[PDB]
Chain A
């Protein structure tokens, strides 16, 4: 896997 700045 999931996206994560």
Chain B
């Protein structure tokens, strides 16, 4: 065989590059950042109709001001979420304040490359970390298993990412309202999803300064799906 922390002749880490392939196989996750909030949406993708879809948790709360969407080997994300929640709460205990979204992301990314021959392999999951703080306002970050994170105005990860990202490129502007962003996530999810989009096989969430991080009910998401269809038929 070969070492776990080995460099390729091109100068990349084999195990990191291979984990990125695992993330491409994962179900789609989209994030859009605005001045009115940050929206997070995911493709649930139930393997069978008997599987109760509400038990698919691919959008997760880290603190009141920080949400998280995942794509790839989602089991790997459990310990990453545990670490993020501990970091967020621990920082609040030590400094009597909310922790910066960037600082929380940086903390999660410090686990990523703690593997070798520490854990046996890199994580096989990417995270969209969305949040608000007083300093840098509404933020969306993409945390890879490479230990790198980029801030994004909008970002798609998973099977339909390259298609969804090209669509976000055209559609995103700096003056987007929260209602517009919600419909845009739903629009781009319906485009890249295999099965037809409804309130059971897709899930919306947002983080606002006022109400914090909220996962949308199936009833609420259903109305936005109905609103989306009418507006596309209207012209």
A and B touch in the complex (CB under 8 A): no
- Residues of A at the B interface (CB closer than 8 Å) are none
- Residues of B at the A interface (CB closer than 8 Å) are none
